[PDB]
Enzyme design. Structure first.
Site, PDB file in Angstrom:
ATOM      1  N   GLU A 166      74.411  53.859  43.109  1.00 58.13           N
ATOM      2  CA  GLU A 166      73.357  54.442  42.286  1.00 58.13           C
ATOM      3  C   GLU A 166      73.619  54.252  40.798  1.00 58.13           C
ATOM      4  O   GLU A 166      72.672  54.061  40.028  1.00 58.13           O
ATOM      5  CB  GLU A 166      73.188  55.926  42.611  1.00 58.13           C
ATOM      6  CG  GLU A 166      72.732  56.202  44.034  1.00 58.13           C
ATOM      7  CD  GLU A 166      71.383  55.583  44.354  1.00 58.13           C
ATOM      8  OE1 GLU A 166      70.544  55.465  43.438  1.00 58.13           O
ATOM      9  OE2 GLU A 166      71.163  55.213  45.525  1.00 58.13           O
ATOM     10  N   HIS A 196      57.123  50.233  57.446  1.00 62.42           N
ATOM     11  CA  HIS A 196      56.679  49.348  56.374  1.00 62.42           C
ATOM     12  C   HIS A 196      55.371  48.637  56.694  1.00 62.42           C
ATOM     13  O   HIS A 196      54.680  48.199  55.772  1.00 62.42           O
ATOM     14  CB  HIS A 196      57.764  48.319  56.059  1.00 62.42           C
ATOM     15  CG  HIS A 196      59.038  48.920  55.555  1.00 62.42           C
ATOM     16  ND1 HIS A 196      59.950  49.534  56.384  1.00 62.42           N
ATOM     17  CD2 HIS A 196      59.549  49.006  54.304  1.00 62.42           C
ATOM     18  CE1 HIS A 196      60.971  49.969  55.668  1.00 62.42           C
ATOM     19  NE2 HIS A 196      60.752  49.662  54.403  1.00 62.42           N
TER      20      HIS A 196
HETATM   21 ZN   LIG Z   1      69.557  51.030  45.856  1.00 60.70          ZN
END
Ligand SMILES: [Zn+2]
Ligand SMILES: *[C@@H]1O[C@H](CO)[C@@H](O[C@@H]2O[C@H](CO)[C@@H](O)[C@H](O)[C@H]2NC(C)=O)[C@H](O)[C@H]1NC(C)=O
Ligand SMILES: *[C@@H]1O[C@H](CO)[C@@H](O[C@@H]2O[C@H](CO)[C@@H](O)[C@H](O)[C@H]2NC(C)=O)[C@H](O)[C@H]1NC(C)=O
Ligand SMILES: *[C@@H]1O[C@H](CO)[C@@H](O[C@@H]2O[C@H](CO)[C@@H](O)[C@H](O)[C@H]2NC(C)=O)[C@H](O)[C@H]1NC(C)=O
Ligand SMILES: *[C@@H]1O[C@H](CO)[C@@H](O[C@@H]2O[C@H](CO)[C@@H](O)[C@H](O)[C@H]2NC(C)=O)[C@H](O)[C@H]1NC(C)=O
Ligand SMILES: *[C@@H]1O[C@H](CO)[C@@H](O)[C@H](O)[C@H]1NC(C)=O
Ligand SMILES: *[C@@H]1O[C@H](CO)[C@@H](O)[C@H](O)[C@H]1NC(C)=O
Ligand SMILES: *[C@@H]1O[C@H](CO)[C@@H](O)[C@H](O)[C@H]1NC(C)=O
Ligand SMILES: *[C@@H]1O[C@H](CO)[C@@H](O)[C@H](O)[C@H]1NC(C)=O
Ligand SMILES: *[C@@H]1O[C@H](CO)[C@@H](O)[C@H](O)[C@H]1NC(C)=O
Lengths: 704, 193
Positions: A358, A488
């Site tokens: 992150e 998706h």
């Molecule tokens: Zn990521």
């Protein structure tokens, strides 16, 4: 400077400063809601987002007055082109509202559909939590098949009519933006122009993806052959040593990842992997300590440290107050140099790697923050995640863990643990590549009308057997929509980004480890304390998407094309090991075997004469259901309500020929023995001939 | 004797608008000046803290401003953060030392409403993006005239479209005890204890 160039630059200056203020308020409102979930905060988030969206739409129409052919500066031209993208606004308001109704219905069906036990109708399950827990841990063949078929029979059939109208509307929108179809519109993220020698065409993506997948196939076949051998121990009855893998035994509902199969496929059971979780607890680590170590890693390669506001504004731990938050690790780029990370961090090895992933997203945002507002993105849709992956690769190596004290100084690494680690990596990385390539190939051909509606389901399972080596456990007709059962597909997201990100991440790692002068196998590389590798990475990160993505790629890796050789180099030690484990096995698969082919009866019909339509097929199944009822009532003294949905038909040719088999009511795992079905057909042989008006020569049951 | 009365008369400024005092031909007592505060850091460079109080120098310079103590790490030598980039860059070409301290309630020093520092200062253009302006050692930021209006919320940007300049300010809440930073530089002699 051209007069049009001067007028466009003045317009972009006022837009850029106005958009920064409005976009920042929209992000700040969203952050306040995600860390503090109240009705009041939801109202503020909606109001701020609507104000920013309204401003953007009005400015987009003003940008339509500028002619891109007259603009000479490529930076001004690139900003105007981004602002001129109409998107869904090209459709008429009548059809735009119609498409939005379809999109919301498919999203609601997916997140609220339920599958229920046949024995107890009152006990039902959602996809998450529920069926996902079963498909991840269960080793019960019958229970895994119940969840796999139930999800597609109950939810996939609702999405089939909606997805057909969704395709028509998406192609109408794409043509209104001067694209061939919607799939062509999706491939425009990889379009590159403006520099000689760095141009990339939209049609190049299809050819390049196929070329790279050809070089992956020899490695994937060795992994497929190894997993098949291990799964024969778990399911001795149900696995063919030379055929495809049943779709419901892949550790996932769609078999997108093979990660959950690792306990059943461990190369060395007495050699557990490296788990430094207990060392962190024994050394009294906390969440703040975890992110301080991540910051040290980026500084050692020459990247800047976190801002003072990062440490005060982030939500690094779960709040101990009466505040309810979303526990999903995300990195936020609010604007004006405001960077935050929202994470519910535990003292575990997995959270240690996620913190590095992150903070890599934050480093990418900070690097291109000097670009114009509309150019503050990754090079293309696959760059941002590729940067995050390589940070976790270096942080997990034993050399890195010894340098931070989480391993003893005299720690020794054996080669049996290395194979365990590499096998686990391949179940996630290598296993998902054929799944991603095949799914997006199917959607591309659907948008191009290469596949008609009458063959949507048929082509889906032909390509599953051919490209992925996966076979369906029950036959499916055109009332199913098996692609749409994935998130998706029913939520209108493109999928090719996962294929290209995987290739980019191993190209990046191989280039940076060469700059770090790493000697040895690629999977043992750590880029720590290398400011030469951090200089090459920084040359690419600060470009944003202000130029061609091929030029940004060449700054780090030195080439302008996708290449799967660095991926094959990373898995070379596992490839050598697999070829020795598969020496006496079969490598490859045949596309003809199926789990239901052994109990099927072949039916051959020569009408020439009425057309064999779908209604005539419905009548045949009812006639078989009638025969099964009579045989059970007369020969076995049992009353079983066989219906036409208990008859499964496969391999229907243009000529009148197919196969069928019978299952028991309420149980899709209980296939009636073929011998008993033959007795049922023989007993009612005369009446079946009268139903269709065909004698024993016109209609014949092979093997009877 | 060197007079420090101007320090106590009014509120200290913010870091990007620091106040400076230069003393020449006067007798100074550093011990009495620092005895009025709770010193939390006395990091010295090219000189000893004991040798700095009793030395004789040709010129003495003091820079002071309001500074929260929890940002202490961002003023250390070699920092690359926004504090050194856009607000204050210490000049190490001469023997200089840095002192962080708190003001007790007994001392009569008015304190500001909040702490303010700049996170970025740049010129903008649609042709190329943002060109940052970095502060020079011992000098002021060129975005100083854009902070006269003030900042109401954190990450507010004050712009001037005539010259295409922008500055962003970050706010920290005022503490119970006012916290300040002193940077003392000397050059080699008319100023002696
Ligand atoms: Zn990521
Ligand atoms: C979480 O949200 C609640 C609700 O918005 C916040 O409570 C508000 O607190 C302010 C002062 O900070 C009061 O003026 C408001 O009236 C409160 N709102 C309500 C609806 O009671 C709360 O402060 C937030 N918590 C945090 C930690 O930010
Ligand atoms: C990067 O280099 C630093 C030193 O610049 C390494 O940290 C040193 O580790 C050794 C043991 O290997 C200790 O004796 C030193 O005290 C450490 N120095 C400092 C300044 O902390 C660090 O391990 C290296 N990082 C790697 C190899 O990932
Ligand atoms: C790990 O390395 C050991 C040696 O340290 C390997 O053992 C050798 O294996 C080869 C065949 O591959 C034999 O010819 C040798 O006789 C073995 N040596 C010993 C001392 O037994 C072992 O195969 C390697 N294992 C893996 C999984 O790579
Ligand atoms: C920077 O600080 C200086 C300190 O001298 C400010 O100038 C003084 O501002 C006060 C405000 O109360 C006035 O009473 C003084 O007359 C000013 N003195 C001089 C010599 O001008 C200055 O305004 C500050 N600048 C900014 C941009 O905030
Ligand atoms: C720009 O748009 C305005 C308002 O619609 C219109 O009056 C004008 O003719 C347009 N000019 C050009 C060059 O397209
Ligand atoms: C656009 O013009 C600016 C200002 O002269 C110049 O710096 C820049 O290089 C130009 N952009 C391109 C892509 O040539
Ligand atoms: C389905 O049949 C299997 C054996 O084929 C049996 O074990 C199972 O109990 C049946 N399912 C249910 C829900 O009763
Ligand atoms: C400086 O001030 C202190 C205050 O305690 C005093 O003891 C000392 O004598 C003073 N020194 C001079 C040189 O005035
Ligand atoms: C100085 O501070 C102390 C400690 O708080 C207090 O007791 C004393 O009264 C103060 N003296 C004056 C003159 O304010």
């Amino acid at each position: 400077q051209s007069l049009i160039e001067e007028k466009a630059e003045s317009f972009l200056n006022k837009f850029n400063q106005e958009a920064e203020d409005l976009s920042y308020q929209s992000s700040l409102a969203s952050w306040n809601y995600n860390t503090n979930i109240t009705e009041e905060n939801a109202q503020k988030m909606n109001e701020a987002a609507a104000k920013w969206s309204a401003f953007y739409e009005e400015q987009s129409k003003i940008a339509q007055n500028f002619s891109l052919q007259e603009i000479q500066n490529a930076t001004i031209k690139r900003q105007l082109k981004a602002l001129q993208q109409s998107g869904s606004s090209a459709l008429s308001p009548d059809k735009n509202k119609q498409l939005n109704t379809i999109l919301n219905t498919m999203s609601t069906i997916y997140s609220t559909g339920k599958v229920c036990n046949s024995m107890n109708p009152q006990e039902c399950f959602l996809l998450e939590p529920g069926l996902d827990e079963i498909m991840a841990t269960s080793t019960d063949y019958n229970r895994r098949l119940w969840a796999w078929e139930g999800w597609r029979a109950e939810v996939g059939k609702q999405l089939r009519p909606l997805y057909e109208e969704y395709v028509v509307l998406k192609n109408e929108m794409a043509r209104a933006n001067n694209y061939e179809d919607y799939g062509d519109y999706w491939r425009g993220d990889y379009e590159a122009e403006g520099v000689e020698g760095y141009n990339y065409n939209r049609n190049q993506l299809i050819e390049d993806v196929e070329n790279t997948f050809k070089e992956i196939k020899p490695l994937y076949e060795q992994l497929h052959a190894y997993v098949r051998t291990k799964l024969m121990e778990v399911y001795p009855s149900y696995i063919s040593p030379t055929g495809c893998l049943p779709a419901h035994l892949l550790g996932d509902m769609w078999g997108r990842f093979w990660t959950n199969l690792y306990p059943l496929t461990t190369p060395f059971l007495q050699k557990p992997n490296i788990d430094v979780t207990d060392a962190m607890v024994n050394q009294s680590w906390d969440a703040e300590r975890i992110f301080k170590e991540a910051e040290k890693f980026f500084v050692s390669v020459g990247l800047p440290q976190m801002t003072p506001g990062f440490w005060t504004n982030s939500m690094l731990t779960e709040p101990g107050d009466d505040r309810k938050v979303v526990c999903h690790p995300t990195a936020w780029d609010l604007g004006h140099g405001d960077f935050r990370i929202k994470m519910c961090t535990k003292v575990t090895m997995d959270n240690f790697l996620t913190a590095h992933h992150e903070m890599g997203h934050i480093q990418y945002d900070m690097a291109y923050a000097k670009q114009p507002f509309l150019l503050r993105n990754g090079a293309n849709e696959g760059f941002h995640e590729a940067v995050g992956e390589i940070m976790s690769l270096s942080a997990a190596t034993p050399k890195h863990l010894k340098s931070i004290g989480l391993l003893p100084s005299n720690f020794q690494e054996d080669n049996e643990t290395e194979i365990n680690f590499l096998l686990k990596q391949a179940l996630t990385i290598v296993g998902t590549l054929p799944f991603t390539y095949m799914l997006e190939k199917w959607r591309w051909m659907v948008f191009q009308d290469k596949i008609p509606r009458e063959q949507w389901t048929k082509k889906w399972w032909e390509m599953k057997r051919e490209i992925v080596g996966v076979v369906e456990p029950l036959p499916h007709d055109e009332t199913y929509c098996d692609p749409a059962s994935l998130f998706h597909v029913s939520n209108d997201y493109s999928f090719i980004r996962y294929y290209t990100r995987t290739i980019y991440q191993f190209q990046f790692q191989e280039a940076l480890c060469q700059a770090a002068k790493h000697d040895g196998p690629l999977h043992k590389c750590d880029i720590s304390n290398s400011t030469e590798a951090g200089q090459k990475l920084l040359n690419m990160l600060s470009l944003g998407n202000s130029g061609p993505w091929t030029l940004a790629l060449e700054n780090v890796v030195g080439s302008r094309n996708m290449d799967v050789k660095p991926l094959l180099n990373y898995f070379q030690p596992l490839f050598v090991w697999l070829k020795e484990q598969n020496r006496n096995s079969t490598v490859g698969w045949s596309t003809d075997w199926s789990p239901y082919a052994d109990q099927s009866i072949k039916v051959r019909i020569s009408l020439k004469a009425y057309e064999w339509t779908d209604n005539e097929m419905y009548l045949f199944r009812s006639s078989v259901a009638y025969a099964m009822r009579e045989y059970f009532s007369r020969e076995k003294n049992q009353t079983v309500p066989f219906g036409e949905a208990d008859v499964w038909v496969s391999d229907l040719k243009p000529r009148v020929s197919f196969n069928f088999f019978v299952t028991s009511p309420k149980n899709v795992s209980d296939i009636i023995p073929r011998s008993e079905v033959e007795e049922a057909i023989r007993m009612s042989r005369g009446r079946i001939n009268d139903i269709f008006g065909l004698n024993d020569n016109s209609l014949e049951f092979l093997g009877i | 004797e060197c007079d420090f009365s101007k320090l106590f008369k009014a509120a200290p400024p913010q870091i990007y608008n620091f106040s400076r005092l230069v003393f020449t031909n006067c007798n100074y007592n550093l011990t009495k000046l620092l005895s009025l505060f709770h010193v939390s850091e006395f990091s010295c460079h090219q000189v000893s803290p004991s040798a700095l109080a009793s030395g004789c120098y040709s010129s003495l310079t003091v820079d002071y401003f309001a500074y929260p103590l929890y940002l202490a790490s961002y003023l250390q030598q070699g920092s690359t953060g926004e504090i050194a980039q856009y607000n204050y860059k210490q000049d190490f070409s001469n023997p200089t030392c840095r002192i962080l301290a708190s003001v007790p309630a007994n001392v009569s020093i008015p304190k500001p409403d909040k702490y303010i520092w700049l996170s970025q200062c740049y010129s903008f253009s649609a042709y190329s993006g943002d060109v940052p302006h970095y502060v020079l050692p011992g000098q002021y930021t060129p975005c100083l005239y854009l902070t006269s209006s003030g900042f109401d919320n954190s990450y507010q940007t004050n712009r001037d479209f005539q010259n295409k300049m922008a500055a962003t300010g970050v706010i920290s809440s005022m503490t119970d005890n006012l916290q300040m930073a002193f940077v003392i530089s000397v050059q080699y002699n008319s100023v002696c204890p």
